[PDB]
């Protein structure tokens, strides 16, 4: 099963909306941690596909990390204000599955933080998730909205819990910790893009920067 | 007894699309057969077709739906897709492209691709023949789209086999015929041979 697990919390409503329809067609299964929300909000009744949540606590975006998956699945952890584009998961599971020659997990958002040196600063690489990237980088940091793995390879709840404030560092950490490499995949400028409404008297915006 | 059998899947957004499709085929075709994904109920605008076998499946198969069906050894068959018009000589001249190529134990398609490893310091090169283009010489290739091909029954991969391949059909479906050491031709055809099917259109 090809499996979505998202966050959000009542303000980001109509972003969220966007984000699950433009993952619906293409996974089959989406997890919505529900941060903050008293019931469960009946413009979500269109999703068969949807499996909402109202924790036990706020989250925020760990919230996408209290989900339990199957030994099998394919998880695509989201983020609630990304339109995903309509061959999202075709194409990111081509990459897992080309890329899989030696264990390591894909993403489109990532960095190369590199460490301070004789007296040079530390430095950061970021491959934004509307940026363009040619050809594929090894990375050694994914932003957790853009990332495409195996179950077996998600960590769980006890592992990301108090990582809200740094939930890409925790993610990455746990990574690197169990030697998994990490894959910034190649796509062309805009495949994704962000939902929004702005300052501007809520203007409804769906190409966000 | 040797029968031209088209295989096919689709789900319910598609419903408009495939009864066009189904059209194409119906004429040129002895069987198809017609992975109804995610329906709950054979819909009543396929009742025209004689030669149609609907079947709504245990599960979604998705683009693996095709492969469900069990085929007799000596059956010809046709892997479709629910959004292309195959042209009135589709079926006629594929046989006689798939005769050509069986001297050397081969299958037949329209979409294919020729990828190249990166090696010493190459860059890794893919060359797509998409199912509208045309192609003047008939070409050697590592795979095949599941939608414009053309084979026997006994090379036609099972659904064990094909089962888990959702969404990267293609591939398994190429690599089967690599470990089974069939070859792969995509054959020559004229510009926009095959179209994709539209909406709201007086073409035909």
Redesign the interface.
């Given at each position: 099963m090809?499996v979505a697990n998202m966050s959000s919390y009542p303000p980001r409503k109509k972003e969220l909306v966007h984000s699950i329809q433009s993952l619906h067609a293409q996974v089959?299964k989406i997890n919505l941690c529900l941060n903050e929300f008293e019931e469960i909000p009946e413009e979500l009744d269109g999703f068969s596909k949807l499996n909402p949540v109202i924790p036990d606590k706020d989250y925020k975006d760990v919230g996408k990390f209290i989900f339990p998956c199957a030994k099998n699945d394919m998880i695509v952890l989201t983020d609630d204000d990304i339109i995903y584009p309509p061959d999202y998961?075709?194409k990111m599971?081509?990459f897992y599955?080309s890329f899989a020659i030696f264990n390591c997990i894909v993403g489109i958002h990532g960095c190369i933080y590199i460490d301070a040196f004789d007296g040079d600063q530390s430095k950061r690489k970021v491959f934004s998730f509307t940026q363009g990237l040619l050809r594929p980088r090894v990375v050694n940091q994914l932003g957790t909205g853009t990332v495409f793995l195996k179950a077996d390879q998600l960590p769980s709840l006890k592992y990301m819990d108090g990582s809200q404030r740094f939930v890409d560092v925790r993610f990455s950490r746990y990574m690197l910790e169990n030697e998994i490499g990490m894959i910034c995949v190649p796509r062309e400028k805009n495949w994704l893009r962000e939902v929004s409404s702005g300052s501007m008297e809520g203007l409804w915006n769906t190409f966000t920067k």
């Open positions: 090809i089959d998961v075709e599971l081509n599955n």
